[PDB]
Design a protein around this ligand. Sequence first.
Ligand code: N73
Ligand code: CA
Ligand code: CA
Ligand code: CA
Ligand code: ZN
Ligand code: ZN
Length: 157
Amino acid sequence: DLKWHHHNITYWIQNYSEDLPRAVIDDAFARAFALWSAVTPLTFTRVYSRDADIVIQFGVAEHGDGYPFDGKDGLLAHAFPPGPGIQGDAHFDDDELWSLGKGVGYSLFLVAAHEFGHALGLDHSSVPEALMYPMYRFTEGPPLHKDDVNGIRHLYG
Ligand SMILES: CC(C)ON([C@@H](C(=O)N=O)C(C)C)S(=O)(=O)c1ccc(-c2ccccc2)cc1
Ligand SMILES: [Ca+2]
Ligand SMILES: [Ca+2]
Ligand SMILES: [Ca+2]
Ligand SMILES: [Zn+2]
Ligand SMILES: [Zn+2]
């Protein structure tokens, strides 16, 4: 689907990377969601249930959906567009080192914010400063660009 048809989105952290403490991973995901909820009518609530809209997984190689990861670097993560089942879900390649990004590894916060954009129905942007641009680059500044917000408002108002 192009967009979620309800506004109260739920998410389930199915498993964890050992790269970071669980509370840090939880917080990284919460911050990524808060980025999008500030600019949409959507809310994001954590649940402990397989019936969540956005199921979050860490995995390596072929991890059950026919879109395999590739070891260290290269592919970082992927997410399915809105809809039932696997649709909406977000998977992170645990052959990466997940971190807060400033030093070694990839920022789990930034990559999750990008993936959650796909999970809400956004495609890749052509603006290099936008969050939805198809290349990772670490930044400590505001991730959202006009294009990201215009993209998400087009879907959600
Ligand atoms: C080369 C691109 C197109 O591939 N990426 C996947 C992707 O786009 N996943 O969303 C594809 C296979 C779906 S990615 O995993 O490498 C990747 C590249 C950049 C980012 C990214 C992360 C934070 C901020 C901006 C871009 C995330 C994954
Ligand atoms: Ca990889
Ligand atoms: Ca789903
Ligand atoms: Ca890892
Ligand atoms: Zn997957
Ligand atoms: Zn992407």
